[PDB]
Amino acid sequence: MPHAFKPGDLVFAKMKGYPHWPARIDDIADGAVKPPPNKYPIFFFGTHETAFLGPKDLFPYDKSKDKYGKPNKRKGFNEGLWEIQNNPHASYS
Numbered sequence: 001m002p003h004a005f006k007p008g009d010l011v012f013a014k015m016k017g018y019p020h021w022p023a024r025i026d027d028i029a030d031g032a033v034k035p036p037p038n039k040y041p042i043f044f045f046g047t048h049e050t051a052f053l054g055p056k057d058l059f060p061y062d063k064s065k066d067k068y069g070k071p072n073k074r075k076g077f078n079e080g081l082w083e084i085q086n087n088p089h090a091s092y093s
Contacts, residue, residue, distance in 0.1 A: 002060075005025050005040055005055060005058060006025060007025050007026060007027040008024065008025065008027075008089060009024065009025045009060070010022075010023075010024050010060070010061035010062075010084055010088050011023050011024065011025065011042070011058045011059055011060060011061055011064075012058075012059045012061060012064050012065075012068040012069075013042045013044065013051075013053055013057055013058055013059075014053075014057040014058075014059070015051060015053075015057070018074065019068070019072050019074060019077070020059060020064070020067075020068040021044050021045075021046075021047075021077070021080065022044070022045040022046065022061070022068075022069070022077075022080040022081055022083065022084035023042045023043060023044045023045060023080075023084075024042070024043050024045070024084070024088060024089075025040050025041070025042065025043075025058075026040075026041040026042065026043040026050065027041075028041055035052040036052055038054055039052040039053060039054055040052065040053060040054070040055075040058070042058070043092070044076075044080065045076075045079070045080035045081070045083035045084045045088070045092075046076035046077055046078070046079035046080025046081070046082075046083060047075070047076035047080065048076075048092050061084060069081055069084075069085075
């Protein structure tokens, strides 16, 4: 049975105006800005942008990839699919 989200989990994350996007739950570095309550730091693959999202917008990657893991015209998306499949826990700084 599911746990809560934790850092390192792989998801598709949904933002208004964008397709469900390959992403991970990030750690928060010592000294870095903390998310708002009930929000997680989401790192978006391909774009390498960060946003804060709640669980309602987080879809576990294994369950969801058949639906959401197809190429997309959007900028950074296909690079994002490579990253989440091939090195989802790398440093992309």
